[PDB]
Structures are given as structure tokens and as C-alpha cells.
Motif scaffolding. Structure first.
Motif, PDB file in Angstrom:
ATOM      1  N   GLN A  17       0.806  -1.147   0.029  1.00 28.45           N
ATOM      2  CA  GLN A  17      -0.110   0.012  -0.092  1.00 28.45           C
ATOM      3  C   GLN A  17       0.881   1.061  -0.104  1.00 28.45           C
ATOM      4  N   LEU A  21       0.496   3.997  -2.739  1.00 29.27           N
ATOM      5  CA  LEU A  21      -0.154   5.301  -2.403  1.00 29.27           C
ATOM      6  C   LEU A  21       0.847   6.409  -1.965  1.00 29.27           C
ATOM      7  N   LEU A  22       1.925   6.120  -1.207  1.00 30.26           N
ATOM      8  CA  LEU A  22       2.856   7.290  -0.760  1.00 30.26           C
ATOM      9  C   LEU A  22       4.027   7.773  -1.831  1.00 30.26           C
ATOM     10  N   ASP A 104       7.260  13.801   7.594  1.00 33.18           N
ATOM     11  CA  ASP A 104       6.130  14.225   8.024  1.00 33.18           C
ATOM     12  C   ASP A 104       5.671  13.433   9.219  1.00 33.18           C
ATOM     13  N   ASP A 105       6.538  12.778   9.944  1.00 32.05           N
ATOM     14  CA  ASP A 105       6.097  11.807  11.003  1.00 32.05           C
ATOM     15  C   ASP A 105       6.389  13.057  12.049  1.00 32.05           C
TER      16      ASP A 105
ATOM     17  N   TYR D  12      -0.054   4.761  11.728  1.00 33.81           N
ATOM     18  CA  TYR D  12      -0.466   5.616  10.436  1.00 33.81           C
ATOM     19  C   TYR D  12      -0.792   6.941  10.760  1.00 33.81           C
ATOM     20  N   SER D  15       2.175   9.977  10.784  1.00 32.21           N
ATOM     21  CA  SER D  15       2.439  10.599   9.330  1.00 32.21           C
ATOM     22  C   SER D  15       1.425  11.327   8.755  1.00 32.21           C
ATOM     23  N   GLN D  16       1.554  12.449   8.305  1.00 35.99           N
ATOM     24  CA  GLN D  16       0.318  13.266   7.576  1.00 35.99           C
ATOM     25  C   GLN D  16      -0.075  12.478   6.366  1.00 35.99           C
ATOM     26  N   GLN D  17       0.828  12.056   5.676  1.00 30.99           N
ATOM     27  CA  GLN D  17       0.498  11.600   4.424  1.00 30.99           C
ATOM     28  C   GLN D  17       0.027   9.988   4.756  1.00 30.99           C
ATOM     29  N   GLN D  18       0.486   9.358   5.736  1.00 26.12           N
ATOM     30  CA  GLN D  18       0.063   8.086   5.769  1.00 26.12           C
ATOM     31  C   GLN D  18      -1.343   8.120   6.503  1.00 26.12           C
ATOM     32  N   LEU D  21      -4.081   8.998   3.406  1.00 26.75           N
ATOM     33  CA  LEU D  21      -3.801   8.020   2.274  1.00 26.75           C
ATOM     34  C   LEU D  21      -3.831   6.532   2.674  1.00 26.75           C
ATOM     35  N   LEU D  22      -3.500   6.095   3.687  1.00 30.07           N
ATOM     36  CA  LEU D  22      -3.411   4.855   4.018  1.00 30.07           C
ATOM     37  C   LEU D  22      -4.600   3.971   4.921  1.00 30.07           C
TER      38      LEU D  22
END
Ligand SMILES: Nc1nc(Cl)nc2c1ncn2[C@@H]1O[C@H](CO)[C@@H](O)[C@@H]1F
Ligand SMILES: Nc1nc(Cl)nc2c1ncn2[C@@H]1O[C@H](CO)[C@@H](O)[C@@H]1F
Ligand SMILES: Nc1nc(Cl)nc2c1ncn2[C@@H]1O[C@H](CO)[C@@H](O)[C@@H]1F
Ligand SMILES: Nc1nc(Cl)nc2c1ncn2[C@@H]1O[C@H](CO)[C@@H](O)[C@@H]1F
Ligand SMILES: [Mg+2]
Ligand SMILES: [Mg+2]
Lengths: 154, 153, 154, 154
Positions: A17, A21-22, A104-105, D12, D15-18, D21-22
């Protein structure tokens, strides 16, 4: 003009995934800056994983890609950051490549007040203003005020 | 005469690990006639009251890898320590001799050839990399492994 | 002062050097308080690793030992803390066992400013005073001003 | 009749993107089976994170959510799996909740032959047929042959 070559180091190819997606959004943001993106999971798509020496040849191929990139854009999410990414980041530092970090963590994980991560990750960045090379969201990549854009424009 | 080995480890992060785990490894390396550069000891005297101490330690570690002859990287843990990994990378890019130590019995990897992520083995030969891979402290002084051979040409 | 049963949860069995040099000092410190120490790597040393079911047997014996201990003493060093220790800590919380944490790691690694680690690890400790259950050196373990000593007298 | 409640435990949200999106695709996969999905990062987005005690309040809410769910769906990607997920999984095992594991990360990282991760993660699963509870892709979640579907349909 000759597009600058960025090696996009990430652990995002280990997960179905995350790879799907990332990575594409990050590749897109870099390409919107005119960058030539070398993404290792894509660049190794056709290996003969039949063969026993496949792991060594992937390691040699990745080593050549880092030696020939102009800069590394290292996804350093996670606690701790990925060890393969870390090896690739130290290669890039020792060879005087341009260095850009992405996290972005929002967890902070370190032994020092200056840096949000282990201080070795910042050894190739200047003492003052390292934050300009440190990206904390995908929509920040495009910023004309951050180091990636400045580096592309001389 | 003696070759310089950079002893990269996460063992300085715990008081108990610094005092109990590192000395035995330092002793084994020195008993082969190696001059050991251990970063936590080599930066004992850096001013840790100052805000810039983290940057000065990073540059000192970078200079030491540039000037060592080989790296001896403790790669225990899942995953191995990230600062060790950066330093192993500098060492690979700079054509330093590379030796790895892992007495962790957990396997944690993406491939069947190597017990860890294949990038850690990028600076080792395709065949015979195991001769550079130590799994116990008492194995360090073994005459059949790569460290001893490296000292004697 | 009572002879309570502490389950000593640690990742120190995974490294030869750590098993013989880091774990015995913590065992001795607890035994110096008159505790009955249940250390899993020793307690399962008499299992038959020759056959393939040894991992299910060790998992079950660890689960029972948490069910039957009076308290857990979780070594939560590392970035991140060990996942088996974390599962066992979660069992102990949900089972209303006494909870004590040990971290002599200098690195702070956390989502939040209150606690030095992921907040879930502290869900079983009081909102105020949790520090008294949180040990940062071997020497501190025997302090009569911290919660472990006081728990034995309760 | 009340819908079965699944607690979706993951790293998840760090992380902003995780988070963006995930998580939604997994929430949808679970909801399409008729499950009420309790996802902690969303369920605690209304806590006042300006106050210092938010970390404690999130920990207690997460603990209560695990006590009141019927099952846990634990995202155990990463090396090692996330420590908060691990504590929540341990709670779920001790409280006899249904247990389901998700890992689409292809890296194996463990101390044993039987399991792809630390054996403690499987202590709440049967000795034989545990793979039926272990999902390796988002697409597998709906499989009528795996344990989640069977658990919902008696
Ligand atoms: N197995 C691997 N396959 C590929 Cl394509 N790349 C790998 C592998 N193991 C390590 N890497 C490389 O190291 C990092 C992931 O550990 C990436 O930047 C890059 F992919
Ligand atoms: N705080 C640190 N001090 C010193 Cl002397 N070295 C450090 C520190 N943090 C990281 N490192 C370096 O990276 C590795 C541990 O992350 C060591 O080999 C080396 F010490
Ligand atoms: N292989 C293992 N053997 C034993 Cl005895 N215990 C184990 C093993 N793997 C995990 N554990 C258990 O989980 C934690 C280590 O991950 C310890 O508290 C406890 F030992
Ligand atoms: N900061 C956190 N907020 C929330 Cl809502 N949950 C958290 C936080 N830190 C840890 N957790 C919990 O532990 C896991 C992530 O470590 C999740 O299952 C759950 F979220
Ligand atoms: Mg052109
Ligand atoms: Mg622009």
C-alpha cells in the motif's frame, strides 16, 4: 537544461500500500520542480529474483545510483529511520552530494535538543539553516523558499 | 604502524551498555594490535552544555570515518542503529575496510542471502562476505576471519 | 515486606553479550528487594527447540506468566521499545497487574511532551506520580522513595 | 442488532501522508463487511491538544476503546511493529477480544521459524490455522475464507 538527478530514498517500497499510494505523490512533487527522479523500487522492477545473487546485484545497482545522483531526497519517517535509507544517506554525505531530508512523522526521537533525529543524519547539512533542507510535508516540497528549489536555480 | 578502526555502535546511549558492552569489544580489537577510535570516548571532552554540541559531534564523527582505515560497526537490534548506518555508509563510499558485528539472533531482512538489509553488505564482496561478519565477541580475534587477515596484508 | 512475583520483561535475551552482561544486574537488583523474579529467557531455557512448535509453547508460557505474576518490570530501552515486551506490558495493564518501567536509554522518543515514550506505555500508571514507577538506572531500582519498594510493603 | 466493533490499531496517524492516504482504504474495507470501525486518531481528534494532560486522556480513551471493542485489527507493518499498537494488542489478547493481524510489508523479522514476527504477537491466536487471522494485503480483508469474515458470520 540537463535536469538535476535526485535519488529518492525511502522505505515505502516494502509495503504494498505504501509503494502504491505514498511514493507517486512524492515523485510527482519532485518532478514538478523539473527534477529527474531515480526511485530505487521502480528502477529495480525487472530484477531476476530467480537468482541467488539478486540481492547483491540490487545492492551494487543502488550503490551506483547513489554515486551518480546529484542529490539525495531521503524519506526519514519512522522510529528509527530505515537502515537502508540511512546507508544511502551516509554514502551521499561522504560523496558531497546535495542532501535533502523528508519527515512528516510528528514523533520526535533523538538524544539532543538541536535535531529531531540522531545527529548523524544532519552531518552533511550546514550548522545554521539546516531546517531549510528539512521537509515536513509533501506540499512543502514545491516551496521556492526551501533548499531544493534554491539548489535547482543555481 | 597500527591500523585505525572506527568502532561504531549504539552502545553509548545507555549507561549500562557503555560501561559493560563496549570495553570487552575495545579490548578484543586492541589485542590484535589495532588502534581503536570509539566515538563516545573520543568526544568525552566536548562541551555538552553548549547548544551546538550535536553539530560538533557529527562533524567529529564524520572526520573520524574519513581518517579511519576501517569501520567496525555493531549492527545489533531490529533495525540497526541509524547513526551507525549513516557511518557505515560514509565508510562504504570512502573505500574503507568494513567489518560487521551482530550477536543478535533475530533475523530481520528483505532477502534470503543476507541476514540484514542488503545495503549493509554493499561494501563487502559477493562471495565470502561472511568472513567479515562476526557473531560473538570472542570471535573477533579469530585468525580465520577477515579482521586478522586485514592486519597482516 | 512481601515476596511478590515480578515478571521481568526485556529484549536482553536476544543478544549473547546482553543476556550475560545486562540482564543479571537487573535480576540481582530485584532479588535484593526480596522479589521472586520470573525472567522469561531463563524460565523457558528448558523448552525443546528441536521441534517446530517451540514458538507457540514459549508464547503460551509467557502469557501464563503474565497472568500469574503480581507485577511486571518492563525493560523498555531501545527505539522503539521491544514489541514482545510491549505486548506483555499490554497484557499486564489489562490484567490489573502492578506496572513498573525501566529505561536507562538517554534518547527521548515520543509522540507527546508529557511522557518520554509513546503514551500507551503509561496507560496503566496514574495520571500524577507515574514518574515513581519509571526507573532510569539499575541503582535506582532499590530506592525506598519509588513505587516498587513501597508496593512490596503495601 | 448492534454491529460488531473493530478497533483499527495502526501507527499511520503519526505521518500526515500516511494518515490521509493509508487509513481510509482500510476503514472502507472493514466497513464493507458491516463492521463499525473505531480508528483512534479520528476518535480522539476532538481532544484539546493544547493542554498538557492530553497524552493521559488519549491513553485512557484508547484503553477504554480496546475494553469495549469486540475485536482488534492490528496494523503490524514496520520493523519492529509500532509499540503502541503492540500494547493495545496485548490488552486485546488478555481481554479475550477477537484478534486480527495485518502486514503487507514483505520483510520478515523474527526470532523463529514458525512466525514472520516476534512470537508474542501470536499468543492470542491458535497454534494451528493462525494464518487465517493474518492478512497480507488490503484486498484479502474481505476474503470469505479468512477469519474476519467467518467471525462476523458466526
Ligand atoms: N530489496 C530491496 N529492493 C530494492 Cl528495489 N531496494 C532496496 C532493497 N533493500 C534496500 N533497498 C534500498 O534501500 C532503501 C530501503 O532499505 C531504499 O532507498 C532502496 F530501495
Ligand atoms: N550523541 C552522540 N555522541 C556521539 Cl560521540 N556519537 C554519536 C551520538 N549520536 C550518534 N553518534 C554516532 O552514531 C553512532 C550511534 O548512533 C555511533 O557510532 C556514533 F556515536
Ligand atoms: N524466543 C523467545 N523466547 C522467550 Cl523465552 N521469550 C520470548 C521470545 N520472543 C519473545 N519473548 C518474550 O517477549 C519479550 C521479548 O520480545 C520478552 O519479555 C519475552 F521473552
Ligand atoms: N498520540 C496518539 N493519539 C492516539 Cl489517538 N492514539 C495514540 C497516540 N499514540 C499512540 N496511540 C495508540 O497506539 C497506537 C499507535 O502507537 C494506536 O493504535 C493508538 F493510536
Ligand atoms: Mg533540456
Ligand atoms: Mg514553483
Amino acid at each position: 537544461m540537463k535536469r538535476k538527478i535526485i535519488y529518492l530514498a525511502s522505505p515505502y517500497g516494502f509495503s504494498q500500500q505504501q509503494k502504491t499510494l505514498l511514493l507517486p505523490p512524492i515523485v510527482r512533487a519532485l518532478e514538478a520542480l523539473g527534477i529527474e527522479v531515480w526511485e530505487p523500487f521502480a528502477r529495480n522492477n525487472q530484477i531476476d529474483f530467480s537468482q541467488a545473487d539478486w540481492a547483491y546485484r540490487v545492492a551494487q545497482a543502488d550503490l551506483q545510483d547513489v554515486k551518480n545522483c546529484d542529490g539525495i531526497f531521503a524519506v526519514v519517517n519512522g522510529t528509527p529511520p530505515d537502515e537502508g535509507v540511512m546507508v544511502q544517506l551516509g554514502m551521499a554525505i561522504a560523496l558531497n552530494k546535495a542532501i535533502f531530508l523528508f519527515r512528516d512523522d510528528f514523533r520526535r526521537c533523538s538524544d539532543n535538543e538541536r535535531y529531531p533525529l540522531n545527529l548523524m543524519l544532519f552531518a552533511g547539512l550546514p550548522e545554521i539553516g539546516w531546517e531549510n533542507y528539512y521537509y515536513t510535508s509533501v506540499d512543502e516540497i514545491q516551496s521556492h523558499d526551501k533548499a531544493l528549489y534554491k539548489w535547482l536555480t543555481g
